[PDB]
Amino acid sequence: INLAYDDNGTGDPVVFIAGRGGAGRTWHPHQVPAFLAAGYRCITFDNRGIGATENAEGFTTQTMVADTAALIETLDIAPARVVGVSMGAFIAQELMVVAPELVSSAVLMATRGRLDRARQFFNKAEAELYDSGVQLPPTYDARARLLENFSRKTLNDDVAVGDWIAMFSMWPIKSTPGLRCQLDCAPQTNRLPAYRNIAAPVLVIGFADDVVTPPYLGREVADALPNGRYLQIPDAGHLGFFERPEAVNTAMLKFFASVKA
Amino acid sequence: ENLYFQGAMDPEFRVINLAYDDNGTGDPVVFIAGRGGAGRTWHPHQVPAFLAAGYRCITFDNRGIGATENAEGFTTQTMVADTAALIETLDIAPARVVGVSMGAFIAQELMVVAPELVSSAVLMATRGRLDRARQFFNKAEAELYDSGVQLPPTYDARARLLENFSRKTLNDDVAVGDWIAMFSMWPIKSTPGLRCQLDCAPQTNRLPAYRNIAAPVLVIGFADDVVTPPYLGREVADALPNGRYLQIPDAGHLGFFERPEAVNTAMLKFFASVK
Lengths: 261, 275
Ligand code: NA
Ligand code: NA
Hints:
CATH topology of chain A: Rossmann fold
Structural class of chain A: alpha/beta
Active site (chain A): 86, 210, 238
Keywords (chain A): Oxidoreductase, Peroxidase
Pfam families (chain A): Abhydrolase_1
Bound molecules: sodium ion
Largest sheet of chain A: 7 strands, mixed
CATH superfamily of chain A: Alpha/Beta hydrolase fold, catalytic domain
GO molecular function (chain A): bromide peroxidase activity
Family (chain A): Belongs to the AB hydrolase superfamily.
Radius of gyration of chain A: 17 Å
Strand content of chain A: 5-15%
Oligomer: homodimer
């Protein structure tokens, strides 16, 4: 099954893999233009479970890893640079485990390598929400998204907040069978030992105020990877790449410029 | 013992009784808890330390809590007048006051209309207006209630934990298990009273009014507090001519419960020197 993708520019290819609920579109407001300006070719796409595949259920991390590998193969861009956030970083991580040959280097944002407690609490709360059929009223849904994705410093800034709240109406997230199944595409065991075998250079970025995937969990992924290093962005919540795009793009671009394709 | 005092007449012309607790014989302190908090919230961590320091502690169940959980149609002014009535009934004017969040807001507004009832105050986790983020949070909570929708239990515990505790607590798996077990011993019931307490909050910028408050005040901000961010407490301190600001690191919105030693120390140090 083909997944929608958007292909931009020419040059060294970078494939972006969004987190749970994110269409490939998530990368265009803040990442793609900056990468096109530094000379890369950018590929974004709709993970299984999103848009045209939003009714897909019963798929797994392995399915999604295969979807990603197939995309890289179908476009004849092996090995590609990869940028992943959360579920997307986990997909990248697992891709490097089974097909290290498709990936030259990667940036992994807001990631983790095991089924830690925070993740367990998140799994349960989200699954429960789905299984109850309860609809959160809109302002209450928007307030939770604010509290979970943004830093302290952002909530203090009355202009920004009015944009984030405007931004939420432009970015609806529909409760679908696909979104539910994406919830399972996360570590269920300790994957750190399997990451010890990944040769590729890797930047892990932790966001300082991230409550969904706390920063220290990315440091555990970076420590495991022989060629991994850890970097922390201050004043960024879980949507750090949207909230501090300059700091995060500068970090990724410096790292990708230091490394061979 | 089971003590009650007569609360103020409300806007629907009813007079109700409110439960209170009174312990010790020393210098009187009145504690005003936040939204959803019974007077007993002050007993695990504040009351023993104040009694050991020779203060007398008055705690009580705010209108909308416990036996009045079904109260509705009251306003900030109703709660200010209740708190005045408590003070006048005990004949302890002018009294030291400790408020947190909604309770700090009540203390502030009490100081504005009845300054002779309060000698000095500690205001924790407070504000004198709602910024854009906090106005929205208030509207979201009102909406949840007015919609009838029940939060599933696990989701609800998660949101309570995230909203109230510092990062350093949240990253400590052992402490998280402790707080979560404790949520079950401190259920927060959804009641008409809890809903009405949500409007007992600044509807306008109150900071210019606080500029006329003479009494000495300590304002305590909790560094990781997202429900009442610490810069809003610093604005209150800046408004108050004899107010001073102090920030507790690694403290969420429930900082007096989560870092009781640092908070208690700071309060006792302030009260030993006031006036
Ligand atoms: Na490493
Ligand atoms: Na001042």
